[PDB]
Design a protein around this ligand. Structure first.
Ligand code: CLA
Ligand code: CLA
Ligand code: CLA
Ligand code: CLA
Ligand code: CLA
Ligand code: CLA
Ligand code: CLA
Ligand SMILES: CCCCCCCCCCCCCCCCCC(=O)OC[C@H](CO[C@@H]1O[C@H](CO)[C@H](O)[C@H](O)[C@H]1O)OC(=O)CCCCCCCCCCCCCCCCC
Ligand SMILES: CC(/C=C/C=C(C)/C=C/[C@@]12O[C@]1(C)C[C@@H](O)CC2(C)C)=C\C=C\C=C(C)\C=C\C=C(C)\C=C\[C@@]12O[C@]1(C)C[C@@H](O)CC2(C)C
Ligand SMILES: CC(/C=C/C=C(C)/C=C/[C@@]12O[C@]1(C)C[C@@H](O)CC2(C)C)=C\C=C\C=C(C)\C=C\C=C(C)\C=C\[C@@]12O[C@]1(C)C[C@@H](O)CC2(C)C
Ligand SMILES: CC1=C[C@H](O)CC(C)(C)[C@H]1/C=C/C(C)=C/C=C/C(C)=C/C=C/C=C(C)/C=C/C=C(C)/C=C/C1=C(C)C[C@H](O)CC1(C)C
Lengths: 230, 226, 213
């Protein structure tokens, strides 16, 4: 009765519409084991939230800074706090955060307390959905937003891969790729840039250098699946 | 069902006249599976209806202009006035996605006959689908159905089967001599002994490749020989 | 009743249809013992398991070559990587025997004792190396998606899809060597030659394949 990924079809037996965003799409059988479904239900939400923050990261950076290109912007920021002091903070400050999230996955009733401010405590929530501090002023129904998080999330995970594969083919940001498509739609598609006939394979070259210098030792910058491109 | 494809032939047991155009045929056993007979019925309707557009394309594109040749009408130099030297990669991008919608909706009408009838965007008017392969409703803007439907359902195939053979004729009367169907009709009706099936079977007027904007094509005739 | 390798002929008595990819093909009756056939079911998988890794490995490094990348061909990838990276060759192969001869005798005592290797004798891991059946260990490490449990009706389908891709991967890795010894070039160079002119650029026109050239 629920909407599906393909309306004439039937959902598989392990998908019964219990979970948010459950449109019945799992052709490869991956939601069969219920031990491993919890791991994937967590990892879809984590993959979505980083990608929502990344796509809105590139879109905000492109509308305020037309100078630098985001694929190259991990190289040119010139922080005064060192190249590896940043990585040292990010390593420790995420090896705290993720392991708290991981222990919440393993035992859900084990991570609720502020360890250094024990007067404060998280509410006994659902796994992957902390709330309490992480969720003030929730608008409307919570399960409505729980589907809005994944629909915008799944749209953004396809968006970031669309950002990367446009950044390796035309090498410009995703409004500059949009301005290439809106100035000339009939010639600026991937079907226009490439075709494989049985007898020759015409693929675009990289708009990406093979390596970069970056302060001494060189860093390899490969085009993600160059050679297997159409 | 009767008046079969040959006089003394017993019709097969699965061809008792239910489907239209049923002539006790299939001397290759392909409709013996009941689940395969429906799909071969759907693929017969597709091969009929595209050929009826194909025949009505080829002998109309040379009545409106007997200049652009239908074998090389796909080359961008031969496209009309707003489309001359279009990017074929862009036009294939339209056609692929516009057809991967339509066909998969038709394909799911095969796989689940009944859960694909509604306009999915506008939950409004449905399509009343009486039987598989015959959607109707908005595919009948003239209301020419809802009469003796079985009579027109036979007329669709008999015109369709002839159009399949005529369109494979339209190709083989074009690779053998490099000439259009009404143009090979003129070539026959001028000298009906030097422009027959003889002395043109065994010569292929098609090159090994015609380059399209940086792409080669294998371009094979349906028999060897040049 | 089931489809057999050769229609008409019945399957042999030792080969009822329960294995994956079973098509009754034992003309030499090599699986006539029910315990050596337990070994050859292990043997067909790990030959197909390495060949599926192999045939994907030849093809993916040959897709990168002939497009313009700096890839070697699969018969020349052995020399070019113990020369670019200064990797001493005997100390590469010996560690290959250490790591895999570890991983192989675990299998060789799964076949001798299927309940074994699950006593905490390893670093504490007990039921990860339990082993579900012959040639299909499963558990946490070897099936991290968890596809061998949940629905078992689709798992029997995946068992057959593994063996089917596993058979023709072994035929491919028998054909990559055969396309190289006959012609003397890479695999997708032989494919693109067969797609240039499908006539006359086949196996019949070498003079290496048929001696009646
Ligand atoms: C549009 C996407 C979207 C939506 C609908 C939701 C919805 C929800 N989230 Mg979620 N979340 C998202 C993105 C989203 N999230 C992202 C990207 C992250 C990573 C930062 C998180 C991290 C997160 C956590 C850690 C938790 C939730 C929780 C919740 C639930 C209650 C909170 C709430 O009312 O949020 C409503 C959300 C909105 C109204 C979206 C407003 C967006 C505005 C327009 C700003 C966006 C643009 C701006 C540039 C973004 C940058 C902000 C910042 C980085 C500078 C609800 C299901 C809580 C939960 O489920 O516990 C019960 C919870 O604990 N989410
Ligand atoms: C691709 C086109 C196509 C397809 C799918 C079908 C399918 C079908 N036809 Mg049909 N038919 C066709 C074209 C086609 N027809 C043409 C062109 C004619 C005119 C000669 C006929 C005349 C005809 C009659 C008279 C009857 C059928 C019947 C049937 C049904 C049962 C036969 C069966 O199971 O075969 C399934 C068929 C296929 C899977 C097609 C396979 C094609 C093979 C592999 C190779 C083709 C041979 C060769 C290349 C043809 C070249 C001809 C040349 C002149 C161009 C089935 C639904 C019977 C019926 O109505 O039952 C309901 C029946 O009585 N057909
Ligand atoms: C001359 C061949 C011919 C014939 C006799 C029919 C006959 C029929 N078609 Mg069909 N059809 C044809 C060609 C034909 N079609 C082609 C070429 C296509 C591809 C565009 C279609 C696509 C098609 C669809 C998608 C549907 C029909 C439907 C119908 C049925 C009712 C409509 C009608 O009478 O139209 C007859 C019209 C003419 C004879 C005009 C021909 C004049 C020329 C320009 C009837 C069985 C409908 C149906 O059965 O609904 C339940 C339906 O859904 N047909
Ligand atoms: C089934 C019998 C048969 C076979 C196997 C061939 C075989 C061939 N014919 Mg042929 N032919 C045949 C009957 C046959 N023909 C008949 C009955 C006529 C009339 C022709 C008229 C004909 C012409 C006009 C030509 C061929 C040619 C050819 C060759 C390439 C096509 C090939 C050797 C061609 C060739 O290369 O000589 C060519 O130009 N044939
Ligand atoms: C790599 C080795 C290998 C091994 C051990 C097996 C093992 C098995 N296969 Mg199998 N198979 C293989 C490769 C292999 N297969 C390949 C490549 C194909 C595709 C052609 C098949 C296709 C196949 C089918 C279709 C069927 C089996 C079946 C079987 C089972 C019973 C037959 C038996 O006792 O095998 C004994 C096998 C050996 C002793 C190893 C073969 C080595 C021989 C002795 C060397 C010579 C082989 C050949 C002539 C040389 C070619 C290369 C040469 C030119 C260099 C058994 C589990 C049957 C079964 O029950 O399915 C599960 C069955 O129906 N196999
Ligand atoms: C079944 C696996 C297998 C196969 C078919 C081959 C086959 C081959 N190897 Mg190879 N090799 C293998 C395993 C294998 N080796 C292993 C396990 C190692 C050690 C890590 C090597 C290390 C190796 C080197 C160092 C070289 C080869 C070379 C060759 C080629 C000899 C001509 C031939 C294609 C030589 C080559 O490149 O051919 C010219 C070569 O120089 N191989
Ligand atoms: C996995 C299947 C496979 C595929 C897709 C190809 C594809 C190709 N091969 Mg190749 N080849 C294969 C397996 C395969 N090969 C094997 C197993 C051998 C060893 C016998 C060879 C030996 C070989 C040579 C010597 C040459 C090619 C060539 C070619 C190319 C041109 C086609 C041709 O000449 O036909 C060759 C086709 C075959 C040899 C047969 C196809 C595979 C059959 C079906 C074997 C399967 C085993 C069978 C079912 C059971 C064996 C029975 C036994 C157990 C008792 C083409 C790209 C030629 C080339 O380089 O082109 C320029 C060429 O010179 N191949
Ligand atoms: C120092 C370098 C040498 C040390 C070598 C490693 C020794 C480690 C070792 O002793 O293991 C420590 C123990 C050793 O094993 C323990 O030995 C005991 C005495 O024999 C008893 O046998 C216990 O049953 C057995 O667990 O190993 C573990 O139990 C590992 C458990 C891992 C649990 C992971 C949970 C998986 C779920 C998360 C996945 C999501
Ligand atoms: C679909 C079709 C053609 C559609 C063509 C189209 C849209 C063409 C469009 C164009 O041309 C125009 C308009 C303009 C051009 O500038 C551009 C193109 C694009 C080129 C032909 C099918 C044509 C299909 C044909 C001819 C199929 C024939 C099959 C037969 C006869 C088989 C019969 C049997 O298999 C059975 C049925 C049962 C067995 O028991 C017995 C045997 C005998 C085996
Ligand atoms: C063909 C084959 C086996 C064929 C056996 C057959 C037909 C036996 C059939 C029978 O027994 C039965 C069934 C039943 C009996 O009654 C009858 C017979 C008839 C006796 C195995 C191939 C098996 C082929 C295998 C396992 C190949 C693996 C290849 C690998 C790992 C390659 C790796 C590399 O290529 C890369 C990836 C990169 C390179 O640069 C480096 C290297 C290392 C070269
Ligand atoms: C949690 C919480 C809680 C509390 O309570 C409150 C608060 C605070 C409010 C909250 C928060 C929230 C948030 C932050 C959110 C965010 C979101 C996002 C970011 C989304 C995105 C999302 C995103 C998305 C969808 C995206 C999409 C995108 C897209 C399609 C794109 C496309 C493209 C591409 C490819 C490329 C080309 O060239 C162009 C374009 C066209 C450009």
């Amino acid at each position: 009765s629920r909407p599906l990924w393909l309306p004439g079809s039937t959902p598989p037996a392990h998908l019964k519409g219990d979970l948010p965003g459950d449109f019945g799409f799992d052709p490869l059988g991956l939601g069969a084991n219920a031990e491993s479904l919890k791991w994937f239900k967590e990892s879809e939400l984590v993959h979505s939230r980083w990608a929502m923050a990344a796509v809105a990261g590139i879109l905000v950076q492109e509308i305020v800074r037309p100078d630098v290109f985001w694929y190259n912007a991990g190289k040119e920021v010139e922080s005064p706090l060192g190249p590896l002091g940043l990585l040292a903070v990010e390593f420790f400050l995420m090896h705290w955060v993720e392991v708290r999230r991981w222990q919440d996955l393993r035992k859900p009733g084990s991570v609720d307390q502020d360890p250094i401010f024990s007067q404060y405590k998280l509410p006994p929530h659902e796994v992957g959905y902390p709330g309490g501090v992480f969720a003030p002023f929730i608008p409307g129904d919570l399960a409505e937003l729980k589907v809005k998080e994944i629909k915008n999330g799944r749209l953004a995970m396809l968006a970031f891969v669309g950002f990367v594969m446009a950044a390796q083919v035309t090498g410009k940001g995703p409004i500059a790729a949009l301005q290439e498509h809106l100035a000339d739609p009939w010639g600026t598609t991937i079907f226009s840039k490439a075709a494989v006939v049985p007898g020759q394979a015409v693929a675009p070259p990289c708009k990406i250098p093979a390596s970069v210098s970056y302060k001494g030792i060189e860093i390899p910058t490969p085009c993600f699946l160059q050679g297997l491109w159409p | 069902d009767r008046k079969l494809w040959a006089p003394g032939v017993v019709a097969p047991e699965y061809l008792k006249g239910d489907l239209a155009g049923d002539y006790g045929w299939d001397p290759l056993g392909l409709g013996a599976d009941p689940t395969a007979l429906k799909w071969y019925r759907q693929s017969e309707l597709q091969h009929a209806r595209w050929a009826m557009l194909g025949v009505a394309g080829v002998l109309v594109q040379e009545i409106v202009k007997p200049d652009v040749y239908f074998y090389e009408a796909g080359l961008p130099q031969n496209l009309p006035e707003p489309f001359t030297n279009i990017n074929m990669g862009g036009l294939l991008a339209w056609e692929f996605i516009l057809m991967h919608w339509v066909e998969v909706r038709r394909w799911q009408d095969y796989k689940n006959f009944g859960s694909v009838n509604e306009d999915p965007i506008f939950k409004g008017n449905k399509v009343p689908n009486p039987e598989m392969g015959y959607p109707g409703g908005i595919f009948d803007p003239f209301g020419f159905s809802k009469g003796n439907l079985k009579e027109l359902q036979t007329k669709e195939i008999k015109n369709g089967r002839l159009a399949m053979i005529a369109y494979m004729a339209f190709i083989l009367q074009a690779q053998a001599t490099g000439k259009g169907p009404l143009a090979a009709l003129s070539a026959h009706l001028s000298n009906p002994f030097g422009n027959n099936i003889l002395k043109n079977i065994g010569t292929c007027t098609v090159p090994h490749s015609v380059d399209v904007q940086g792409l080669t094509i294998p371009l094979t005739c349906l028999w060897p020989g040049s | 009743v089931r489809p057999v390798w050769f229609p008409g002929n019945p399957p042999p008595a030792h080969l009822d249809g329960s294995l994956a990819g079973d098509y009754g093909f034992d003309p030499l009756f090599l699986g006539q013992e029910p315990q050596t056939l337990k070994w050859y079911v292990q043997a067909e998988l790990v030959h197909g398991r390495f060949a599926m890794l192999g045939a994907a490995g030849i093809i993916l490094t040959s897709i990168g070559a002939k497009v313009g990348l700096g890839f070697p061909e699969w018969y020349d990838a052995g020399k070019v990587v113990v020369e670019k990276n200064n990797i001493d060759f005997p100390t590469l192969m010996v560690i290959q025997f250490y790591l895999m001869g570890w991983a192989e005798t675990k299998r060789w005592y799964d076949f001798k004792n299927p309940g074994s290797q699950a006593d905490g004798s390893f670093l504490g891991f007990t039921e990860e190396f339990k082993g579900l059946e012959n040639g299909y260990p499963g558990g946490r490490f070897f099936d991290p998606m968890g596809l061998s449990r949940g629905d078992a009706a689709k798992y029997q389908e995946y068992k057959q899809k593994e063996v089917k891709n596993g058979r023709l991967a072994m035929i491919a890795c028998l054909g990559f060597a055969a396309q190289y010894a006959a012609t003397g070039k890479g695999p997708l160079d032989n494919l693109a030659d067969h797609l240039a002119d499908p006539n006359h650029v086949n196996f019949a026109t070498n003079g290496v394949s048929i001696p009646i050239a």
